[PDB]
C-alpha cells in the first residue's frame, strides 16, 4: 500500500485514540478519512487541513505532519466501533487517488479473548478424489482482528491460501477460517504444514503432518 | 497553457476606487470577450463578501477575487495594479484588513488550472523583486512577464 | 437527501464485459465530479476512477490495474454515471460504490492538484467474475471438548445452507462464510464443538442444501 494504516487498534470506552495514515504523498497532500461498517456505505469524517462535514461528531479530528496523517477520536463511543480508511493522492502531484488498508477500531465492550485454533488435515475420503485441503478454524477471539499465515515445513506459504474475514458471532466474539489448497501428491510430500495465527501481538501455531 | 491571457487583461486602476469598483473593472474585459457570464462580477463580490481573499504579504498586499467555476466559460486571468492601497478582508480570519495593491482576478473553470495558477501565485507573491516590478512596469511589460511564466 | 443508486452488478465471465450504472439525486450533478470505488472480497476500499466536470472537458483518470480496460462516462441529462468494464479479470470481483467527489486545495500549504474526497457514497453493486457453471458441493467430513465439522467444497453459485443433526444440534455451531477460490468455485466450512463425552453415543450428521444445483447431502463425521 502507498498509504499504510495500522491493521487494528483498541480503545477503552470514553478514552481517546489516534489512528494514523503514512506515505510519501502525504508530504505534499492532505488525507481524507472515512468510516465504514459491515454492509453499510462509507461516510466521510474529515478532510483537508481542518474540515469536518456537518453531522460528523466533533470528537473526530484530523491532523498531519511530515509523511503522516492522523485521525483522533476524543472519547470513543460504542457507535465508533468500525473500520477507518484514509485517502489521498497516490504520489505527489498525481491526478489519481488511493486508499490506505483500513484500520479496524475496536471499542472494548468485553474482556479480551485469545482465539481457539483447530487445524484439520485432508480427510481420506477427500484424498480419494485427487484433492487436498487444509482447514484452519479460528474461533472465540476478541477483538475481531487476526492475521493468519501458513507454513510448509518452516517456509511461508502465500500461494493457495484463502482466509475468511472475521465474522461476528453470537456472543459478539469473532470467528474466522483459513484454507490452504494443494494436491495430494504435495501434502504427502512435506513433513508438516502449519497454520500460524497472530492476535493482539501474540502468535499461536497449529501443525499437521501427513500421518493418519 | 489552456489559459487565455491577453494584453488588455492588465489594467492600472486609478485612485478613488472601492472593492466593488475593482472587481467590475477587472471583470469588464472578460465579459466583453465572453470568457465569463454577464453577472460574473456580481458572483465575485458576493463570494468576496462571504469568503475574503486578501493576502497580507509584504511588501505589497495581494487579493485574488474569483467565484464558482460554473460561471466561467473559458479560462482567463485579469490583473489590476492599484494606484492606492484598497483594503480587502483577510482570507484567513482576521478583522485587520489587507492593504492590497495587486489584484489577481481568476476566471478559471478547470480545477487543474485553478490549483496550478494558485501555486504559481503563492510563489510569485513571495518574490519581492517580482512584486516590486509589478508596481513600476507598464501594462505591456506586466503582460509580457506574466504571459511568460504562466506559459511556464 | 443525497442518493446514489448503483446497479448492473451480477455474475460475469472473465474476458467478458459488464456495464454498471449509478443514478444520482439531491445535488448539482452537472458540475459534480464522480468516482467509482470497489471493495474486493475480504479487502479494503480501492479507488477505480473518476470523471471530472465540464470545466475539465469531462476528462477521466483510472487506477493502474484498470487503465485501458474500463471506461467511465456520464449522461448529465438523466443524472447517471457509468462504468463499462471490459476484459474482466477474476480480481475485478467486488462491491462497486459510486461516490460524489469534492475538491480541496489550501492556498498556503497546498500542492497541485490538491485532493479529492468522497462526500456521499452509494451502497454498492456486487460483481462476481467467474467462468464456473452451476455445480453442487462435495461434502467431506472433518473428523476430530472435541471439534468436528463438514467441508463443503467446490460449489457454485451461492448460497449453501447447512444444519447439524437435521435441525436439532445447534449449541455452538459456527457455519463460516464461504470463499471464492481461484477456480471460481466456492467453499465453506461448518463446525460444531462438543464434549468428548458424546463421540461414543449419538452420531453426528451435517445436512448440506444447495438449491441452484438441486443438491442435498448428509455426511457422518465419526473419528477414525
Numbering used by the authors:
A (entry chain L): 2 to 9, 11 to 95, 95A, 95B, 95C, 96 to 211
B (entry chain I): 10 to 161
C (entry chain H): 1 to 52, 52A, 52B, 52C, 53 to 82, 82A, 82B, 82C, ...
Original authors' sentences:
In this study, we structurally characterize the interaction of the broadest and most potent MPER-targeting antibody, 10E8, with viral membrane lipids and scaffolded MPER and propose how 10E8 approaches the MPER-viral membrane epitope during neutralization. The membrane proximal external region (MPER) of Env is one of its most conserved regions and, hence, the focus of vaccine and therapeutic design efforts. T117v2 is a variant of the previously reported T117 epitope-scaffold that presents the 10E8 core helical epitope residues and binds to mature 10E8 with 29 pM affinity.
Mutant 1 has glycerol from the cryoprotectant in the lipid-binding site, as also observed for the wild-type 10E8-T117v2 complex cryoprotected with glycerol. A diversity of ligands (PG, PA, phosphate, glycerol) is observed in our structures in the lipid-binding site and, therefore, other phospholipid head groups could potentially occupy this cleft. Our results indicate that 10E8 interacts with the viral membrane via its light chain and engages MPER in an upright orientation with respect to the HIV-1 membrane. The 10E8 light chain would then face the membrane, with which it interacts via CDRH3, CDRL1, and FRL3, and possibly additional residues (Ser/Thr/Arg/Lys) of the light-chain surface.
